[PDB]
Structure 1
Amino acid sequence: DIHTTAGKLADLRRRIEEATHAGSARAVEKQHAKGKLTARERIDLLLDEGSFVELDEFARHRSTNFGLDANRPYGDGVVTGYGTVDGRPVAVFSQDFTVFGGALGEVYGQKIVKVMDFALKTGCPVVGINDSGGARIQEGVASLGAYGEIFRRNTHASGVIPQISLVV
């Protein structure tokens, strides 16, 4: 159904499946062929088993430039959340190359800002896993705004909470 409670739960499960598999099969195929792991496989390696708690899993971009609104994948190209590393709190984001070539967008960037604000607020390390072709050109200057907000956070958090950049 859908108008029933059980139907809404089943609906959620479906979206979860779609979100956890945002990138296409061929995209993932291309990634693995380059000797690279997917955004989620990397997070599973970093965090302690079962500690991962995803944030903005169902986030989607709000752009209509150059037919971008034709495809609005859940997560918008980056996996984020928090968990524990060796039992200690850690905030993390993992850019998804299989989605828009991992090109940084507005929502995409806002997700990274949320994880950084969480880390600063709670005082825990930030592990950034980078794998992006660059700025999502369709969004124009909006992507530059995202970068800037991130740079600002990077600077304010400098010497406050550990920041490690994993470039894969």
Structure 2
Amino acid sequence: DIHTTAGKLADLRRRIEEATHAGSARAVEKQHAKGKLTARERIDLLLDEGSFVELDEFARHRSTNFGLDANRPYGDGVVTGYGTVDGRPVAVFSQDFTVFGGALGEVYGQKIVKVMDFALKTGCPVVGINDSGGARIQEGVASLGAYGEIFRRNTHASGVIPQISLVV
């Protein structure tokens, strides 16, 4: 059902499904076709096996600009979370090109932040895996604001926590 405890659970399983499969079945093929690996595949190859814990997985945006509300994928374009690397704590965000061209959005940037605030407060590096195709033009300045709060964290934490950029 859906009003029971067993359905409310089964429901989740359903969500964690289309969630890890936010991009199109074709976008992934294309991605692979170019040799590139999917965002979630970059995280797994990097972090220690089974140490990845995702944050903001079921987050979505709220931009009604240019009818973008018809496509509100879970994750909103980026996979962020924390995990270990060679036994040491590491925080990481992986830009998902198979979603809106992996363009920076409001909720998309907020996540990258939530992770940089966590990586700094707990003193662990921040592996950033990029693929962003550009700013999400529909949201206008909101996407510019997102890039900022991030640039500011890059500075405030420059020299405080290793920050590595993976441009693929």
TM range (shorter): over 0.9
1:131 and 1:138 mapped to 2: Cα distance? Answer: 19
* Superposition deviation, residue 40 in structure 1: 0.2
**Any stretches of 5+ residues in structure 2 without a counterpart?**
none
* Superposition deviation, residue 34 in structure 1: 1.3
How many residues align? The count is 168
1:52 and 1:69 mapped to 2: Cα distance? Answer: 30
1:45 and 1:27 mapped to 2: Cα distance? Answer: 20
1:32 and 1:130 mapped to 2: Cα distance? Answer: 16
* Superposition deviation, residue 30 in structure 1: 1.0
* Superposition deviation, residue 33 in structure 1: 1.2
Spell out structure 1 runs of 4+ moving beyond 3 A: none
Instruction: Spell out, residue by residue over 1:96-141, the C-alpha distance to the aligned partner (whole angstroms, 9 max, x if none).
Output: 0000000000000000000000000000000000001100001110
SS class of match (1:80): strand
* Superposition deviation, residue 3 in structure 1: 0.3
Instruction: Spell out, residue by residue over 1:39-81, the C-alpha distance to the aligned partner (whole angstroms, 9 max, x if none).
Output: 0000000000000000000000110011100100000000000
**Any stretches of 5+ residues in structure 1 without a counterpart?**
none
* Superposition deviation, residue 6 in structure 1: 0.4
SS class of match (1:8): helix
TM-score (norm 1): 0.99
The percentage of counterpart residues that share the same residue type is 100
2:76 and 2:129 mapped to 1: Cα distance? Answer: 16
SS class of match (1:16): helix
2:64 and 2:159 mapped to 1: Cα distance? Answer: 39
